[PDB]
Amino acid sequence: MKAARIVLDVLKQNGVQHMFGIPAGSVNAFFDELTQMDDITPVVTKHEGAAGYMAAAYAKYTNHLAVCIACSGPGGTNLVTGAANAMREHLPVVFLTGAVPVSTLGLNASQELDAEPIFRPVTKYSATVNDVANVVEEITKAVEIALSGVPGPVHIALPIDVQHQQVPDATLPAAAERNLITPDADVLDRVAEELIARESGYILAGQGIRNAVPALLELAEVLNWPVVTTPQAKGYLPASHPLVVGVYGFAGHEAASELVSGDAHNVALIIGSSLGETATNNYNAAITQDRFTVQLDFDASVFNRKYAVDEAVLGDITLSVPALVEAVKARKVKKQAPSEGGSEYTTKNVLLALQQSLPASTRYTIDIGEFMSYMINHLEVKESYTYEINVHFGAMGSGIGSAIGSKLAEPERPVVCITGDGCFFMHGMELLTAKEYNLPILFVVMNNARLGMSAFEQEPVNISAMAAAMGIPSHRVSEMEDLTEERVQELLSHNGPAVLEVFLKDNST
């Protein structure tokens, strides 16, 4: 086999059904072999940066591997943003870059650039494979590292000559198993006793609970403790659950900060949050002040970064939370008022009117802009897994990319992307990618003709008109009367992308 096809066969054997990126000469050994592979679809994007946002979302929502591929040089460096994002999110994305021939590196070959040291700071593993005899050990090694321990992105560079050489030994390795960080059962036995013993506490749930939501809720029930989520984890716990108070942190709820900053709960049970800027209201001491601190995390670096932890529970949440529930069982709230929408033409009232016209199962993918604060603070979490938020790396356009990744990984779930004017100018040509793959996504663009959150203000663009010129259904909302259930429904009914442009210069905070 050609080296390029063995690399795809390893990805296929590991369950990959999509590859995101842009074809070119230095990566068309890959694309010309995907001509004859019914099991893998290349998803051609308009910018490789967006391909990385899609891959991360795809990895997140398939709970497995994702893949990007880009040409040597400019394609590879356009992927660095997507890898930095995936690295911060602990998502297992393989970044495949072309390379110029082994013989001609150093000679200013066309699109020459050694990608290995550029990807090294934003990946768990990075390698340029300069010998066809090492291709299977390197793609195999990259795949196990991406999926093992604390998952993360990896980068493999394949010179174009190597891509076409035959691999000496084509034997395929088995599919990688995720090697989870296993929790110390002795530690869990003691923590359970210490949670009983100290009687009162609260749970701060970050996004690390995302694969153990039923267990996380059962632990709160067994302890009868209230739960607050980080802004990033807003969509993991339904507002209907009697123990779920709301969001603590950036754009968070008054009921949740009154809990955290009061004198009522002895234990701070921190489950799956790195306790960064947006989870802690810029490192406010209230979360753990005058409390006993228990933190559950699989990344050992996170403990005692800023908040001293009395019990650090190293281990994967999908092992330790269900284990903790069994240990607590063997040994033995206020809430946030939902927000009410109104008639005045405000970002708050537009988004709330929007929510009441959409299925309860809708996943909101939220881009980076002022509208993010209203989504986090005002909209209701109707069911679990419904808010794709990034308040970490926060790349503009990652909301657009995550809508496309989510619709590819979980087609049965409806998707609305809440984005903005500036995010549309950066990555809104991907809507053409959504069109080519026939993906039903409603893109709600909040056009305020400024990069908010006179160089900042622009002459307004008719984004609804741009969408129509792209052959994409759209409506422009310029008043509240324009936002009708009939229009929202008629847009979601299309088999492909649609744009609801909300032209709204709201000067509120």
Ligand X SMILES: Cc1ncc(C[n+]2csc(CCOP(=O)(O)OP(=O)(O)O)c2C)c(N)n1
Ligand Y SMILES: Nc1ncnc2c1ncn2[C@@H]1O[C@H](COP(=O)(O)OP(=O)(O)O)[C@@H](O)[C@H]1O
391 binds its own copies (CB under 8 A): yes
506 binds Mg ion (CB under 5 A): no
Asked if 216 and 273 touch (Cβ cutoff 8 Å), the reply is no
Question: How far apart are the C-alpha atoms of 62 and 75, rounded to whole Å?
Answer: 25
Residues that bind ligand X (CB under 6 A): 22, 24, 48, 71, 74-75, 78, 368-370, 394-396, 420-423, 446, 448, 450-453
How many helices (H) and strands (E) would you count in the chain? 19, 18
Question: How far apart are the C-alpha atoms of 4 and 11, rounded to whole Å?
Answer: 11
* Contact of residue 370 among ligand X, Mg ion, ligand Y, none (CB under 5-8 Å per partner type): ligand X
∠ Cα 392 394 397 (to 5°): 155
By CB under 8 A, which span of 101-109, 132-140, 172-180, 258-266 interacts with its own copies?
101-109
284 binds its own copies (CB under 8 A): no
288 binds ligand Y (CB under 6 A): no
Binding track over 175-214 against ligand Y, x by CB under 6 A: -------------------------------xxx--x---
- Going across the sheet that includes 66-70, the strands are 41-44, 18-21, 66-70, 93-99, 154-159, 125-128
130 binds its own copies (CB under 8 A): no
What the block records as the tokens of 160 is 């174009």
448 binds Mg ion (CB under 5 A): yes
278 binds ligand Y (CB under 6 A): yes
Cβ neighbour number for residue 461 with a 10 Å cutoff:
15
428 binds Mg ion (CB under 5 A): no
282 binds ligand Y (CB under 6 A): no
Cβ neighbour number for residue 340 with a 10 Å cutoff:
9
Rg of the chain, C-alpha, whole Å: 24
Question: How far apart are the C-alpha atoms of 315 and 268, rounded to whole Å?
Answer: 18
Question: How far apart are the C-alpha atoms of 263 and 449, rounded to whole Å?
Answer: 45
**Least gap, CB of 298 to ligand Y (angstroms):** 3
Question: How far apart are the C-alpha atoms of 474 and 205, rounded to whole Å?
Answer: 38
DSSP class of residue 174 equals P
Q: Binders of its own copies: how many residues, by CB under 8 A?
A: 77
Asked if 202 and 273 touch (Cβ cutoff 8 Å), the reply is no
274 binds ligand Y (CB under 6 A): yes
* Contact of residue 283 among ligand X, its own copies, ligand Y, none (CB under 5-8 Å per partner type): its own copies
Residues in the chain: 509
* Footprint of its own copies on 345-384 (CB under 8 A): none
∠ Cα 72 74 75 (to 5°): 65
By CB under 6 A, which span of 311-319, 341-349, 395-403, 499-507 interacts with ligand Y?
311-319
By CB under 5 A, which span of 243-251, 407-415, 425-433, 441-449 interacts with Mg ion?
441-449
233 binds ligand Y (CB under 6 A): yes
268 binds ligand Y (CB under 6 A): no
By CB under 5 A, which span of 390-398, 402-410, 421-429, 437-445 interacts with Mg ion?
421-429
Q: Binders of ligand Y: how many residues, by CB under 6 A?
A: 24
- Which is nearer to its own copies, 421 or 506 (by Cβ)? 421
Which residue intervals of 334-462 are DSSP H helices? 347-355, 371-378, 398-409, 421-427, 431-436
| 222 Cβ neighbours under 8 A, 6+ residues apart | 325, 328, 329, 332
- Which is nearer to its own copies, 458 or 478 (by Cβ)? 458
Asked if 49 and 82 touch (Cβ cutoff 8 Å), the reply is yes
**Least gap, CB of 230 to ligand Y (angstroms):** 3
* Contact of residue 395 among ligand Y, ligand X, Mg ion, none (CB under 5-8 Å per partner type): ligand X
Q: Which residues in this chain contact Mg ion in the complex, by CB under 5 A?
A: 420-421, 448
Q: Which residues in this chain contact ligand Y in the complex, by CB under 6 A?
A: 90, 108, 150, 206-208, 211, 230, 232-233, 272-274, 276, 278-279, 297-299, 302, 316-318, 392
